[model samples]
Target: NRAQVAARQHNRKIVEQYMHTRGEARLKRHLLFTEDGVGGLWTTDSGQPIAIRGREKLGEHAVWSLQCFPDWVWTDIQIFETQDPNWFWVECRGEGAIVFPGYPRGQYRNHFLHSFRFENGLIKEQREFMNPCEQFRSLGIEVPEVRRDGLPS
Candidate 1:
């Protein structure tokens, strides 16, 4: 799971930069997939492109695609080593906030679960889940429920 480990480490660096800089430039550079209406081909640490819509959804998309938070401070972490090569499961707890363009700031507490898949010494795919209701609520945004047809989860 070297690729997974590397991806996590890479994200750690990105998050640190985000917190310290508190600017949108870095996130826009690294996380944004398109300037054409805020939704396009975005990717996770494993290089899997995730189609997303709106700046408000960025944090959730980042978690699922990147398998790590690039704008939060991770406080506690638990790693589960897998018998399979280049694969691992991770659980983490962290707290932070997201400030979207033209939107109110949202506080967050991340409890995440992620699985990393790697290929050819690089991350190939990452599956992750988190509860972002608190963040959305704090920002006065409505939290959408997951539907069978694929809505926010």
Candidate 2:
């Protein structure tokens, strides 16, 4: 369907821009809303959902990573097809070795994949698979053991 493909393109690019943007304004433009007014969520590695909800919620979690990983980059991510016709989706594989700051032992971020469910051409839900265990531990956040697909145990 054209809706599926169109949403696929939009989602992939928006994900890239929102996650990998190296600046303030460009990041917010993609994270907050389109010219038509919509927003998206970014699920954290620890399972707490964070969002680019407004101009003020620029949490800078990744911006902190920027301080540690000047060589940070998203590499070899893929968008795969699915069988469920009840909905169309983007199951993308993204790998990164970003160094999340403020971790006393230091942290290397490797977000292997994410699955986003689309609704009416916008992302309704997002799930992340990045494991920054040290980062979580350093922040006093406990990392829960879960299935490999990022589901809760």
Candidate 3:
């Protein structure tokens, strides 16, 4: 029990750093590691799951996003501990503008939810969730091609 408590606190600190730190430092230090290394799975607005294994893959995605949203920022953040010692949830508001050509030019703000699974005082699996339909709608972008085949028709 003591070890679990310690791991929880340690993991929370790691998450805080990982969440707020937006730069090379994030991937260099905040990216946790274990015997199995780091793994991540993110579902797209179209319900496609992308599996990322190893810290490099995860860092690649972060860098790609940073290139698109050069001024990305997060606020009103909150982290909660789940009943399981290793599982934690985070809620935050993200504000950013898609800089890519042909996309909306206004700031897109949306609430994002994420869950992290920790092991050995490090994040083993991290998942992010957000409703792109609502996010795009708020930004006046029409995303008619998004498909949700997993949902009941």
Candidate 4:
């Protein structure tokens, strides 16, 4: 039906915009909320899963990236529609640097895949996949850290 197509298109637009925005405002504007409560999950390929259930918790989770890469930007984005209209996918390359002290200062560019799920026209959950080792290599750190030892060489 046209309703499903329209919703999918709109959700794709939101997904594209979400990657380009920064800080807590992005989460406040796009995060899901229902009668039960605010809910969301952000998990990476090589990091522990972060379960979020409230606005405060979500904001706190964002602090890590904000401090590490305050100006991360995604380029060459490609968005795709899935058979399930509620699910969408986006592939892009992100460029940014780890600004914290003792972290690699080189600007890094790495590919990323974003899987997004929409519920009632709002983003319900998001899963991200990116190679931490590739990102570290791009940052000029050749040695694989302890957490990344099990990852591919």
Best by TM-score: 3
- Where does candidate 2 stray beyond 4 Å? 12-29, 32-52, 59-65, 68-70, 81-111, 118-125, 134-153
Estimate the TM-score of every prediction. 0.47, 0.46, 0.76, 0.70
Error of 2 at 39 (Å): 9.6
- In order, candidate lDDTs are 0.49, 0.47, 0.71, 0.68
Between the candidate structures 2 and 3, which one is better when assessed by TM-score? Answer: 3
- Tens-place lDDT digits, model 4, residues 17-116: 7766765554454354322223332444446754565545655656766777767788888998898888888898888776656766767777888787
lDDT tens digits by residue: candidate 1, 18-96? 3243234434432422222133333233355444444446544554433233365554566665555555566776566
Better of 2 and 4 by TM-score: 4
In order, how many clashes per candidate? 3, 0, 0, 0
Which candidate has the top score in lDDT? 3
Judged by whole-model lDDT over C-alpha atoms, candidate 1 comes out at 0.49
Clashes of 4: 0
Superposed by TM-score, candidate 1 places the C-alpha of residue 58 at a distance from the truth, in angstroms, of 12
Candidate 2, residue 12: CA error in Å?
A: 4.1
Ranking under TM-score, best-scoring first?
Answer: 3, 4, 1, 2
User: Which regions of candidate 4 fall more than 4 Å away from where they truly are?
Assistant: 23-55, 100-104, 138-153
Model 2 residue 143 CA deviation (Å) reads: 10
